[PDB]
Amino acid sequence: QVQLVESGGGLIQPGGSLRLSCAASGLTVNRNYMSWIRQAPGKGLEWVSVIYSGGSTFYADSVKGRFTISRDNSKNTLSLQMNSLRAEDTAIYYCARDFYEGSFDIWGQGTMVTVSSASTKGPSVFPLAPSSTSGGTAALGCLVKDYFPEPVTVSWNSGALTSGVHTFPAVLQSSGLYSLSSVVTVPSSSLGTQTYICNVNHKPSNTKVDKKVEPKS
Amino acid sequence: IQLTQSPSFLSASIGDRVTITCRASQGISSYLAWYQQKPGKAPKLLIYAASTLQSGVPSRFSGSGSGTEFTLTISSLQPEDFASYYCQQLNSYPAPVFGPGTKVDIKRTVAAPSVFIFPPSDEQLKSGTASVVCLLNNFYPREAKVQWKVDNALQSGNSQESVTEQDSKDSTYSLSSTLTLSKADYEKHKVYACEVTHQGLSSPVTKSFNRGEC
């Protein structure tokens, strides 16, 4: 029953504008303290803006004069107009209801806002080639480098190889492009008997890459 | 007013009594709330007004304190309680404050990492860039340190690293560090190494290669 549903998140270049919406059911937006809270990737929660049932609006200093909160009583929705968007504004944006002095009981699922000047680029997939030196366990992998935007999906041997696979969180490089690595550990003795292929899929660029990873000669 | 949260990271087992502390730089009486958050989910209200249990939250959660010292206590930790936890200053419009957070992970015995170093591929070097990758596989606890060395010169400001979530099967972490240089810079040095320090290692472990040597 009671829920808040966000929409309107997406990709936008710096200085552009985006509008978030929070469609409420089971509570009445204009009868409540309604707030927007954001969380950057890996960071904590940051309160953004509130609108009182009485109409008063307040804003965190890092968004003042750029963001505008509002509501539509006929559609029981809460909105957030975001102007002059900056890279640091990249976050997941929650709407929440404040029922006691800031305590948020009902939250939306969040919507993602990405602010970047980067252009859509497909990854370059480079082999992480096993050492050509010891015995026991061998590691090999793929370096999925210089793509935008998120996400990419990596599988090994078309999904037949799942055990021992570690696909790491991507890192945002100072170039504006993401980069990640995906590794798998296997028994040393299998490096000469089993072929290993990582399958990289980046749907925003319509890019699918299969890379054979072999020990270097 | 600022909120600190202690400890930053906490390792616990199923059935333990876990206490998390939030500290306010001034006397805020009972104006505090506690949230739980799991990766990719919205926060979930646990406690408000320092000690009132939010409805539907299990009773093993309780909050206490007043003034500056607040604690969240899970009396018997359950598998779905492994998450992050945040405190919040109430009655602080127009500027609510959230604590930095506490991450509670699954305790297990110490496991040293398997360390592997990967040279840049010949294919990438044709592009004018060299990515050197160092891998730390299946270790515990999460605290680990990768030190890149280039001809024994400690490198800072040219690496990025990333860590997996605690593995569902063996409760370990894995770390990937990438050292990035221009092809020109990369060809000015010979010995490329990453030195790993970790609780499970009696002494630091270094994996290296010499550029140009297979």
Place this chain on the structure above:
Amino acid sequence: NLCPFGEVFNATRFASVYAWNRKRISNCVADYSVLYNSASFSTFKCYGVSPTKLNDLCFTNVYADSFVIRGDEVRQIAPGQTGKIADYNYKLPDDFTGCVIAWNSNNLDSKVGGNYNYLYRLFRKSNLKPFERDISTEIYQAGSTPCNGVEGFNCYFPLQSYGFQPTYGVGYQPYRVVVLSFE
């Protein structure tokens, strides 16, 4: 005969801000210089009138409103302010002519374990008009389903206590406020 300012400023107990008191003051000479010179006031801000050059004037009616609020809420007792207190408890007009006087009352209005006598309205559908006083305690309905006087989900008691304690931070401590408006 002097004006009963001592009866207002030195009153034994003050009212909660939501149920603020108003003293009608007529037919008396007042010495506002004795008021301003008292260094025992944290806030003494006058709007539309100079503070010192006030003794030699003539107004039909003077109103002395008084209540208790937090330290951090005193800034809301001014024209054109927004917030819990200004929207839902005590509202001054934008064209206000008068003075706002305040002082810390931690040693009178805070008690160990919390003084729960002083309250403020937390919930109200619309803002107060200037000099409006709302003293209702009906359960505030925050959703479609009506409350019928039962607190619960989407059904909130509108008043909350400041719980003033002597060890509070200054921003949470009690301040006594006197608002003098001149008609």
